[PDB]
From a paper:
Here, we report the crystal structures of cell-cell adhesive homophilic dimers of mouse Sdk1 and [name], each mediated by the four N-terminal Ig domains. These four domains adopt a horseshoe conformation, like many other IgSF cell-cell recognition proteins, but they interact in a unique back-to-back anti-parallel manner not previously observed. Overall, our data suggest a model in which Sdks form cis dimers on isolated cell surfaces, which dissociate to form trans dimers through the same interface when contact is made to a cell surface expressing the cognate Sdk.
The Ig1:Ig1 interface, for both Sdk1 and [name], is centered on N22, which hydrogen bonds with the main chain of R23, and is supported by interactions between hydrophobic residues (L19, V25). Mutating residues in the central Ig1:Ig1 interface (N22R in Sdk1 and N22R, [name] and [name]/[name] in [name]) resulted in the loss of dimerization for both Sdk1 and [name] in AUC experiments. These results—particularly the [name] [name] mutation—highlight the critical importance of N22 and the two hydrogen bonds it forms to the dimer interaction. The Ig1–2 interface mutants (Sdk1 N22R and [name] [name]/[name]) showed a loss of both homophilic and heterophilic binding revealing that the heterophilic interaction observed here is mediated by the same interface as the homophilic interaction.
Author numbering: -1 to 379
The structure:
């Protein structure tokens, strides 16, 4: 036949996540190819936003937090339709510190744990601790946790005054200062007797998606005298001699994969001492986004009234769920329908009608991501 019948496809897929500034102009794109004319239609959180249009771009003139969320387009032409992989638009912003001043106490020789003041913001801001206008960096006796929690180890009388933070939003440059947390050190000035080692900030069960550059476990401990305090990290019972930083309070695993998943434990102990060591540990879980193992031929031809199977096999951690679309419409695979979904993921269509012709598209989804693959089904006479 004289006319072109190249079905729609995506030249490129959109980013999974993108942070954009409040009030900026946002231009989402459907980078689709296929025989002309191609029409485009947009979804926001799976609710229709626009009607089919020749325009492949969706433009938001000024972006606010209401317009955040998931976007995906549907593209069609004479052949059929495809559903795009969605992108999450995240609107950067920052408010102001609203909690107000706080008062906190700690006993001599114990550690003061001061959570950082909460501020509404995206992304999470860069937090710096201050006291008396001077920055408070990590040291032998001062820890700062992955959550910007200040931990003052083996507190003494001078460790008392007003502590506050500075928050900087690296996307919009905003710079705000919190209300102080006032710290009191009590029962000051006894004999500086030794205090047995305790773990104040224990390892957290941690998840990370493969492809992430780094994952960190954290363990903050207290003892008196601090100079004798020693932190040892263990994987599978054997001490780790690499990847440790930040006064032994951190363990870094570079480019983690499932091989690095398992139980990591932290042991706090005192050198030249008879005191018992204390151990706390957690599980590192590594997720893998869906990857196709088998994708269908881009074209499948089957005879009318016959049966056809369309393969779709994907791997992932956790094992991904599989969803079928016919021209961007969810396929209903309930009984009393000609459509059955295989255990290996494949879609089986029986009693083929000529209307079954068109794009069949398969999504593999899990918490770590989504992948899509498709084929043109032609039902011949
Ligand atoms: C941290 O999580 C574990 C369980 O996590 C799962 O099991 C691991 C073996 C590993 O497969 C991880 O990737 C999993 O996500 C919690 O362990 C449970 O602890 C309770 C008692 O507290 C016990 O009765 C259950 O049997 C445990 N469950 C399992 C599956 O082992 C552990 O408590 C978590 N630690 C936290 C939240 O601090
Ligand atoms: C935030 O503002 C204060 C006051 O102008 C300034 O001293 C500080 O350096 C700023 N922080 C950053 C990260 O720019």
């Amino acid at each position: 036949g004289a006319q072109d019948d190249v079905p729609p496809y995506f030249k490129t897929e959109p980013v999974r996540t993108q942070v954009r500034l409040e009030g900026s102009r946002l231009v989402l794109t459907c980078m689709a190819e296929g025989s002309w004319p191609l029409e485009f239609k947009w979804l926001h959180n799976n609710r229709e936003l626009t009607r089919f249009s020749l325009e492949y771009r969706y433009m938001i003139t000024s972006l606010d937090r209401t317009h955040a969320g998931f976007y995906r387009c549907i593209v069609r032409n004479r052949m059929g339709a495809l559903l795009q992989r969605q992108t999450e638009v995240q609107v950067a912003y920052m408010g102001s510190f609203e909690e107000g001043e706080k008062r906190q106490s700690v006993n001599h020789g114990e550690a003061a744990v001061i959570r950082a003041p909460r501020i509404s913001s995206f992304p999470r801001p860069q937090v710096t601790w201050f006291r008396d206008g001077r920055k408070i960096p990590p040291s032998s006796r001062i820890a700062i946790t992955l959550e910007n929690t200040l931990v003052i180890l083996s507190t003494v009388a001078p460790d008392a005054g007003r502590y506050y933070v500075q928050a900087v939003n690296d996307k919009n440059g905003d710079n705000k200062t919190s209300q102080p947390i006032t710290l009191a050190v009590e029962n000051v000035g006894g004999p500086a007797d030794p205090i047995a080692p305790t773990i104040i900030i224990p390892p957290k069960n941690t998840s990370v998606v493969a492809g992430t550059s780094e994952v960190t476990m954290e363990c903050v401990a207290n003892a008196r005298p601090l100079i004798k305090l020693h932190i040892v990290w263990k994987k599978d019972g054997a001490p780790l001699s690499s990847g440790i930083s930040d006064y032994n309070r951190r363990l870094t695993i570079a480019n983690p994969t499932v091989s690095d998943a398992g139980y990591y434990e932290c042991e706090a102990m005192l050198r030249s001492s008879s005191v018992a060591p204390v151990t706390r540990g957690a599980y590192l879980s590594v997720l893998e986004p869906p990857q196709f193992v088998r994708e269908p031929e881009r074209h499948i031809t089957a005879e009318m009234e016959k049966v056809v199977d369309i393969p779709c096999r994907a791997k992932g951690v956790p094992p991904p769920s599989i969803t079928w679309y016919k021209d961007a419409a969810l396929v209903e695979v309930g009984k009393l329908t000609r459509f059955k979904q295989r255990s290996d993921g494949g879609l089986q269509i029986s009693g083929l009608l000529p209307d079954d012709t068109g794009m069949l598209q398969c999504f593999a989804h899990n918490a770590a991501g989504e992948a899509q693959t498709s084929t043109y089904l032609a039902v011949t006479s």
